[PDB]
Amino acid sequence: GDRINTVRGPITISEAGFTLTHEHICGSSAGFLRAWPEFFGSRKALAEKAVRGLRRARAAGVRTIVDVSTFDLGRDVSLLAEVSRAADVHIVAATGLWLDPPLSMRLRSVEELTQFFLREIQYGIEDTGIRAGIIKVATTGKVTPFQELVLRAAARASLATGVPVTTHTAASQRGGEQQAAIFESEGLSPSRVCIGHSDDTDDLSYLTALAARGYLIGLDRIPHSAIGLEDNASASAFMGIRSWQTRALLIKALIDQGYMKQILVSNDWLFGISSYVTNFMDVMDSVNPDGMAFIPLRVIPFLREKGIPQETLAGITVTNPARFLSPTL
Amino acid sequence: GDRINTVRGPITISEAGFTLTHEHICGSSAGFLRAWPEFFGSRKALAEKAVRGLRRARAAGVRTIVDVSTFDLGRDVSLLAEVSRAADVHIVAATGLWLDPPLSMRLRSVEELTQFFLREIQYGIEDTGIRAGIIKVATTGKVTPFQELVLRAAARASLATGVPVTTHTAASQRGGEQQAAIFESEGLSPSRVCIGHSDDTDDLSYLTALAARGYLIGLDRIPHSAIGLEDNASASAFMGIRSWQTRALLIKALIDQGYMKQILVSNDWLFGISSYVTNFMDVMDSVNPDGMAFIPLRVIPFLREKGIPQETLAGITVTNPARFLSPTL
Ligand SMILES: C[As](C)(=O)[O-]
Ligand SMILES: C[As](C)(=O)[O-]
Ligand SMILES: [Zn+2]
Numbered sequence: 304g305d306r307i308n309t310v311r312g313p314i315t316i317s318e319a320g321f322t323l324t325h326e327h328i329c330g331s332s333a334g335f336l337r338a339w340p341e342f343f344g345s346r347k348a349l350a351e352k353a354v355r356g357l358r359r360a361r362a363a364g365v366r367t368i369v370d371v372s373t374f375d376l377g378r379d380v381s382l383l384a385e386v387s388r389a390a391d392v393h394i395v396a397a398t399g400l401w402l403d404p405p406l407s408m409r410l411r412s413v414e415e416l417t418q419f420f421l422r423e424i425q426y427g428i429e430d431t432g433i434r435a436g437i438i439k440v441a442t443t444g445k446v447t448p449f450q451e452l453v454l455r456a457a458a459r460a461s462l463a464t465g466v467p468v469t470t471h472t473a474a475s476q477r478g479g480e481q482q483a484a485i486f487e488s489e490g491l492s493p494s495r496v497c498i499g500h501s502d503d504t505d506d507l508s509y510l511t512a513l514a515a516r517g518y519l520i521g522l523d524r525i526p527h528s529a530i531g532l533e534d535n536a537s538a539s540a541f542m543g544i545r546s547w548q549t550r551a552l553l554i555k556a557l558i559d560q561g562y563m564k565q566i567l568v569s570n571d572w573l574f575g576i577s578s579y580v581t582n583f584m585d586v587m588d589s590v591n592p593d594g595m596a597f598i599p600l601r602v603i604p605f606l607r608e609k610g611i612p613q614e615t616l617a618g619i620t621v622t623n624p625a626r627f628l629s630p631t632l
Numbered sequence: 633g634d635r636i637n638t639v640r641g642p643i644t645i646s647e648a649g650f651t652l653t654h655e656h657i658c659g660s661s662a663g664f665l666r667a668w669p670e671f672f673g674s675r676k677a678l679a680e681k682a683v684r685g686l687r688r689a690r691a692a693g694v695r696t697i698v699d700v701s702t703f704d705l706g707r708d709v710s711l712l713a714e715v716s717r718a719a720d721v722h723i724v725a726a727t728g729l730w731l732d733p734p735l736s737m738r739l740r741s742v743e744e745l746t747q748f749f750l751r752e753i754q755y756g757i758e759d760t761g762i763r764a765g766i767i768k769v770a771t772t773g774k775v776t777p778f779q780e781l782v783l784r785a786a787a788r789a790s791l792a793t794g795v796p797v798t799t800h801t802a803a804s805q806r807g808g809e810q811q812a813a814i815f816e817s818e819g820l821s822p823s824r825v826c827i828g829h830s831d832d833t834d835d836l837s838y839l840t841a842l843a844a845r846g847y848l849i850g851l852d853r854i855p856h857s858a859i860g861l862e863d864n865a866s867a868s869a870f871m872g873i874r875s876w877q878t879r880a881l882l883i884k885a886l887i888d889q890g891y892m893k894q895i896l897v898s899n900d901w902l903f904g905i906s907s908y909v910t911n912f913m914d915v916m917d918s919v920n921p922d923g924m925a926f927i928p929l930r931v932i933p934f935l936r937e938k939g940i941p942q943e944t945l946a947g948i949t950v951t952n953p954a955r956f957l958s959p960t961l
């Protein structure tokens with residue numbers, strides 16, 4: 304499993320390089336971008352903004368991003384392919400389901416969901432022939448019965464194809480522990496799983512325990528902070544009010560505890576978003592003008608200043624993603 | 633002043649003919665048909681089924697159907713256009729929102745929803761250039777805050793364009809009353825509004841009181857009958873336990889009250905469905921083998937044999953839909 308699917312086709316994992324493991328071109332809903340592109344100004348404006356952002360990220364060293372947008376997050380792979388080519392940055396696309404499944408998804412069995420996930424990995428997404436290289440799932444703190452079906456379907460797709468699973472958690476409710484339990488009940492290896500949004504909490508006991516079990520730990524929202532924007536309730540609700548430095552110290556914390564190999568770092572950024580309040584993309588860009596370049600431009604020097612070896616940062620930003628994304632049975 | 637938009641372009645009132653005013657090619661979810669066409673066997677198979685179904689309805693006298701599938705019912709106007717051309721049956725497409733709006737819709741303001749409905753009517757659906765000729769909305773009895781927004785946006789779109797509004801109600805909860813109040817508060821003429829699924833109840837005083845206020849009464853679920861079987865946890869809750877003759881007699885009842893000009897009749901049929909339990913399409917087809925031809929092949933002769941004159945049935949199936957659909961302010 305030394306080759307992975309990208310929206311431009313299969314690449315060898317040595318080509319991935321510096322990889323951001325949790326990003327989005329656009330945060331939306333199924334069908335929404337094509338039915339109402341004017342919500343984003345235009346489809347063209349959105350594509351142009353993504354190309355400019357990805358190009359600047361590439362200038363900073365990024366060579367690959369994993370777009371973890373699912374069907375129900377409005378994933379438009381044709382858009383991902385277009386901007387990947389124009390920016391010349393690898394984009395790995397996802398299957399799976401996020402927190403907004405429509406009826407036609409909500410009512411399906413674990414067997415059906417499994418077939419859908421397998422379709423997008425082994426056949427292609429829609430009629431594009433583009434194949435997902437990862438499975439994205441999301442749960443509330445307490446996993447719902449449908450969400451549990453989604454996790455079991457993800458595990459079975461992973462076991463059949465070797466592609467990894469990445470999750471959305473409510474880290475303040477220690478959501479990963481319930482996810483991990485369902486995953487392991489399906490015989491799935493923790494090394495195939497990233498428990499994401501884990502920088503949303505400062506509970507190191509929770510993080511190290513998961514890492515100790517072999518789980519990848521996603522510290523993937525480092526630039527998200529509504530500090531200075533406390534009066535904006537939606538900003539506080541979405542990004543929290545812990546500083547980005549606070550988030551970044553968890554990377555050091557986990558290195559210091561000997562878990563350098565379990566860490567995955569990202570921005571959780573996007574170039575448009577319709578799945579939150581109107582104009583929110585502007586609020587986010589007001590806080591983090593670096594966009595997806597925030598990890599290489601701001602976080603990497605911060606960690607070096609704190610004394611973390613270059614070789615360590617390189618293993619985290621390059622080696623961990625490659626071992627993670629490489630289809631592994 | 634005249635033309636009605638169809639998936640093949642504008643048609644004149646006289647071209648519409650026998651019109652079924654509440655139907656579906658496929659009941660699904662946004663993005664679903666194109667992301668998982670195998671759920672329906674294949675897109676090709678679904679299309680072939682719809683064309684045969686439309687051709688049979690056509691041979692039974694039908695010339696136009698109104699597909700009231702909204703964005704969130706997974707309306708695929710490219711499919712409607714294909715099957716309309718192949719069957720030579722006019723199809724009117726809908727805008728609006730049903731009961732499963734995704735997060736990118738649920739967070740929107742009344743102003744934004746008005747823009748979306750207006751773009752589907754005035755500009756076109758997606759990138760197809762096909763314009764909606766009806767606005768479809770739905771409430772669940774007690775109107776939720778979001779649903780009230782949808783209804784007001786629908787009224788504002790209707791008022792800007794003259795295209796009519798058609799609704800889904802919980803008729804057993806007399807839902808059409810709260811809908812009418814909202815519409816009227818917006819300055820919408822009741823003659824621009826059809827209150828649908830009204831045959832879901834036997835409460836004629838409810839129906840007559842609405843008809844008296846100028847509303848069109850949609851008796852559009854006549855074949856929906858799961859009788860003889862008090863043991864299906866899906867078909868009984870979905871289709872009810874009243875005979876179709878009982879539903880159809882409501883047409884007679886309203887005609888006798890003198891309200892023939894405010895009756896609209898349909899099947900609420902479809903050729904694929906993913907927004908319920910798996911294989912529910914087989915259950916429906918077994919219940920009503922006639923599909924969309926049920927109204928002309930079964931209901932019309934039934935009414936004729938109860939004494940209803942031909943010119944009255946023509947008024948209902950041809951004249952009432954033309955007046956309803958022709959954009960008017
Ligand atoms: C689509 As998200 C803000 O849960 O990473
Ligand atoms: C798609 As329906 C059963 O609400 O008319
Ligand atoms: Zn997330």
Ligand SMILES: [Zn+2]
Pocket residue numbers: 325326327371571
């Ligand atoms: Zn994300």
Ligand SMILES: [Zn+2]
Pocket residue numbers: 770800801829
């Ligand atoms: Zn309905």
Ligand SMILES: [Zn+2]
Pocket residue numbers: 654655656700900
């Ligand atoms: Zn319907």
